[PDB]
Design a protein around this ligand. Structure first.
Ligand code: AMP
Ligand code: AMP
Ligand code: AMP
Ligand code: AMP
Ligand code: AMP
Ligand code: AMP
Lengths: 288, 288, 288, 288, 288, 288
């Protein structure tokens, strides 16, 4: 049939996934209670499902493409491998959204001196396989304690010596007497392809879609920069701005496209280097 | 230590559970991000957790009481039993909230002639163990297809011949080309006790709490009814109103407490039986 | 086929209409985008439509029952009669919700001396037929100015000398330099039957439904009152409480059911008449 | 002119004040941006103002009645008295809403041994006069530190050794490293009259209004109770239920009106005393 | 007096209309309940009215300018013309918002072979005049069925063979057993002038306003594009980018202003044509 | 210790202040109930407090920097000076948000002929010190009437002849029978430093922070403009566009950075001066 892409129906990645495909020129209605939507022009099926189920759909080839976050995907990969299976998939690419970090946390009123210290302790978590891979690699053994939510209760409840959980502002942990202490895994949403052989047409589309994804991401990361021919030191400038597609010089400045962001520190440097009237303009779309 | 009761932190049973204990005279703050709250007077700890984790907490004796819905509890019971374990628990009582029904559903454009018809087919569901117990009992075998959400996609997506899911208004199914066809399990929230021996004091409290629960539930189910001494047929009246604690007769009506509800049909009957000016008054609290 | 009742899909009467039928024991789902819902038990079809269209649906017999407010219904009746037609309908009954009043309003900085004063003036309104019936009856002629909303602009905009509109708090008028000055029509929602002959079964149902409506309305209007045998003046008591179903006397008070409300003024009277410890208890349901 | 009652325009007492007067039979519109509303029937003016300004309006006789919470009123009384003035007012009555408590709080990681311990320390607060009256009475001196909000920062910010603030769930304090330790003042909304002589008519109204207030409050506090003639011990029953208007005895129970609430403990007692089928019914309105 | 512009008080065009005039440099307050607002500087009156009433206000010259959607305007034009009148107006211009499409729809389970097929059938709609103009032109006759909302009930309710309605996501139709089948009219908001002679001053303003409208629309549609002198094929480039105001060439790219949007397809072409690093930058304002 | 910056916890300046520091590269969590937050990298403490308390915190040196609006700051300055104190502070800079204006207002039905007219009258206000400074300077004396909110009641309530209050849309005043008549003070948020000597390190940071503030403000105010070498009149162009950093000329336009905004009037001029295709592009960040 036609192309089948799996995406989270409702949660942390849904708005962003919905948005990418639109931005890639994908007309489709998501204001519907229906879960398997046909795209209004391109021959594309979007299945709105639970994030938890995406890796597997992809690993069983029951869909061709999926948008899912690294942690979930990798957790389920290790799960099957621990059951003896050989799940297979192609990572087409890591995306520019969904960030999150999985971290070790311990009671605030206890000082920390590294992971070895956890040897023999009980750690609660929803990500048993990711935590085990990390400590194993580190030679540390531990007793797992499984919970699917509210993981932060574990310590103040006598369920564990410590926990491993998604953290961001760090609010919950403080409110639950714990503090971050080591990030063991950082994840982003990514785009994955099913295993096996792909037909000419749909693969042509997959290939096509990918490039539009690249452009959408570039455009939001990249910027158009305009300085001032600091003649001499002109060299040192370029090094702080990995343009990757050549500055343009003009007697009277410089005009170039930066893929990365101009953090204050970096501008702070340019300045002291003698650069004047530094400008950054947004780019709405780009094809390079 | 003191009494430990597990309840859903956020979802379908949280408001109602929060409400029962209040109604049972339990001062405690739930407007906090903290997950293990001490009750402001009674020596009680409330752990706000994921519903999915409650059965187990209870079955491992890591808490003493839990409020959780029948389906979730029974699903996890069958899960462990299938792994060879012997999870143990006391059901103190079934509650008056959390209702839901698990049902078989099939594509609307296909006619249905009972469960045998599913023999050999693939059914998708989040409740693999409850579905298997039901069909097994019925002698029907089937191929399971596991999803944790959006279960209704299965058919229109070539993943299954049919699904088994929580249904209520019936909205999703229609929007997903399916129709209900058989209810296989009806669930309500219930109150459960850990296995093992319980100390004097906390058990005294558990015992105490139970009675307050009974009164709160009675009061909302029961009503105060006032009719009119239909002298003769006076008998036939009582039969429609399972009072369970004796009518009261007065020459001039009747005044009694009904545990059940006065549905229209039932009042419709009383009437035709000759009963006049039938009244139903709410009861805010009761101790019987 | 089966019974067909028309109700407003979304607006001022929808919540209340939805509520009545439920209260009358009508299972049906309104959380759906579908507009012609079948009731889950009783053989009933509910068509969710625009209030504006209800009178006509009923007057063309394209449905059997409708819930619609008096003003809208009567406006459309006069509309057709002005076109030469003979729309026909039975009013089964006036309901206990939807109240509103249509009123004449004039610029605040102008003093008012009755309707005759409008003779020859221009009045803006969305209810041209109701306004015309009223002034005609009064012998006053006027120039109509039609608007379907924002009627209050008319004066401060040179479109009319005054307006006729739905008023309630009176907010808009003040904010638009106008003041109420005469109520010409007061409306409530009512229940109407199509013209023609009605089959046995569905009419049986219509007849049945009506009685449940009566009970629901009574119960919310009526109350259970308990005083104190003011022996002598005992007479004067009853007159302030149109019980309509006989007080009950007890030496030791009175116990009776009032259909109307006990306004302060009325209680204020009882009191001064020598009545003590006056009580009013809510009634949740009743069959008389 | 006519009667003038001051009430909070928006905040903690507004909904409840708005509600009382309605419940007292006061038609008036508060869905308006206008701040001095005339009541649609009774000759009453309602001024919607800042709670902070109410005491003074009342103490300057610029309005006749005010609804304001004890803490605010008493704080401003002490303020003026400290400036040398003699603000005067009549408390007509304490209401049944607005509860709150002003309390001393100190850093959690410090143990507490009573108020004397604060002698010589700095305490931050928005209620300098209420705190000073309390410690003065106790012989303790202290250094004040004034803030109008976010008072809980003081300690963790080096601004004070401790704070005195409105507390309820106790959330902020925990999130700010502090714990309650002594309640120094408990407040409720109350109803106050201006100083001076009051005219016949408006005073007649004030007098009238008061009684309706009493009835509204009684009705929500009081309940209708029905037990069972525990013949012998019949005595001991009455003592737990301060009826204040005589039980009613019936051979076959008891039927009476309790002004207070039936807490579990109290019902728990009745029970053990031999009382059976205890009932509590709501009262919607009452005139005693 | 001064200039009078009519706009929808609340609905689909209000936010956008409010926004245009602001963007055109029109200070005025719409956070008010007042319906005829004076603009804080320019001598302009804005009347906030019901969209339904705009065409007519304009056609009766009771205002000078109006913002209203094509369908509504044209429906009312045909309405009057059918009553024998000669409504007159100038279309100053079609705007860049308010899009919508009026379409024929038929039951999903029935296959479609063009409009002739409807000859003799009943079609329900709120736009009787637009539907009639379309089929008349096509030689097809039909029976109209008028509803002002919920038009999608018609078929599943036996009221019509099909419907003609505003469609967008296509949600309602599916939920009501219907599918789109032919778009008969596409509408956008437009700006219209009253008939008759216009004074010097206000016309000067109308003329002025128009140009600012043009600039606001251009700026949001147009973009600044930067490619790379693909020397040879340089020609073929320009054809895909209707610049309308001359590219700019630079040895080292191209820098130009496109009025239209760079759809993927078009960029896809440029690329394959040999164009590199294609950029699109937003334009916030422009005067050409 | 480290740097301490005071900001409003919740109100009119909080979102904007929160935003500036982020924009200045300040990582910190404000989704917390905690009031004294440490910034996740830079050695910075943010105290979330009541705006009313900021001036003083700064004037007592209990924090080093504060973001607070001019009116509040200046009101409290005059307050202390009237008590005999000598509060001291450095204004680092006026910001680009928080605008508001304090104005004299009088009953609509009374005509106005300047401030002298208020001599001897009573004016109500929350800003007694700012109003007094203004009229004093003008030689006018008056009687103050203090209120902390709902100041607009004063006139229609017999409390004052007129009021002085924050005005914006002008809604309240109209709804309270008043009209603006003279703006006496215009305020914006500003950034202030404590009095005294500042250490090397933190001052280094303060100095650093300031420059980032400048860039963030410039970027949002400034724009990138592109015209067309109107050769001759080329001169007259520059005068309308205070570039402050030199246009750039190109035979084929002009390319420059305007610090101010291109209002219509100004573009209207350029145009008539012969300028063509005028463009304005947003600037996201800049370092000059
Ligand atoms: N990025 C995320 N994706 C899924 N869950 C998350 C994510 N971030 C935080 N959570 C959950 O929300 C809480 C952490 O957020 P926070 O309190 O802001 O640090 C923890 O209980 C996490 O389990
Ligand atoms: N009572 C429930 N508890 C948990 N999930 C439910 C419950 N009821 C419905 N759901 C989920 O919500 C949808 C059914 O609701 P409905 O469309 O109203 O019939 C299905 O996808 C169910 O999986
Ligand atoms: N009961 C009602 N039903 C329909 N429209 C109403 C109703 N009441 C008020 N309106 C409209 O809302 C405004 C009146 O409400 P109010 O300002 O509260 O007096 C007027 O513009 C009326 O046209
Ligand atoms: N009843 C109240 N009236 C006015 N302010 C209050 C009241 N209760 C709490 N607050 C403020 O809100 C916070 C306390 O609420 P809580 O965190 O729930 O204990 C404190 O910062 C108080 O200053
Ligand atoms: N653009 C529109 N303007 C006015 N009404 C609309 C518009 N679009 C849709 N509607 C109404 O809303 C429903 C269609 O929206 P949808 O279900 O998203 O396709 C139909 O019932 C239409 O009558
Ligand atoms: N910028 C402001 N900052 C603080 N309070 C304000 C501000 N603007 C208006 N207010 C208050 O809100 C009302 C004025 O807003 P408006 O009715 O839109 O003109 C007055 O009662 C002011 O006291």
């Amino acid at each position: 049939t036609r192309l089948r892409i799996a995406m989270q129906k409702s949660g942390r990645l849904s708005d962003d996934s919905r948005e990418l495909l639109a931005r890639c020129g994908i007309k489709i209605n998501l204001h519907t209670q229906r879960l398997i939507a046909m795209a209004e022009n391109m021959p594309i099926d979007i299945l709105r499902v639970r994030d938890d189920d995406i890796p597997g759909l992809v690993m069983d080839g029951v869909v061709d493409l999926g948008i899912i976050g690294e942690n979930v995907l990798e957790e389920e990969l290790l799960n099957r491998r621990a059951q003896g299976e050989d799940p297979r998939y192609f990572t087409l690419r890591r995306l520019d959204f969904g960030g999150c970090r999985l971290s070790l946390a311990t009671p605030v009123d206890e000082a920390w001196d590294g992971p070895l210290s956890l040897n023999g302790k009980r750690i609660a978590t929803s990500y048993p396989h990711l935590l085990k891979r990390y400590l194993d690699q580190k030679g540390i053994s531990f007793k797992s304690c499984l919970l699917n939510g509210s993981v932060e209760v574990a310590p103040r409840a006598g369920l564990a010596d410590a926990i491993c959980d998604l953290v961001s502002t760090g609010a919950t942990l403080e409110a639950n007497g714990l503090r971050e202490v080591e990030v063991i895994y950082r994840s982003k949403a990514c785009l994955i392809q099913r295993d096996g052989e792909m037909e000419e047409s749909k693969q042509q589309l997959i290939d096509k879609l990918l490039t539009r994804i690249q452009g959408v991401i570039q455009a939001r990361e990249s910027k158009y920069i305009m300085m001032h021919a600091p003649t001499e030191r002109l060299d040192e400038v370029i090094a702080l701005l990995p343009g990757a597609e050549r500055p343009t010089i003009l007697p009277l400045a410089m005009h170039m496209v930066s893929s990365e962001t101009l953090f204050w520190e970096t501008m702070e440097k340019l300045k002291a280097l003698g650069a004047s009237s530094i400008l950054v303009l947004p780019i709405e779309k780009m094809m390079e």
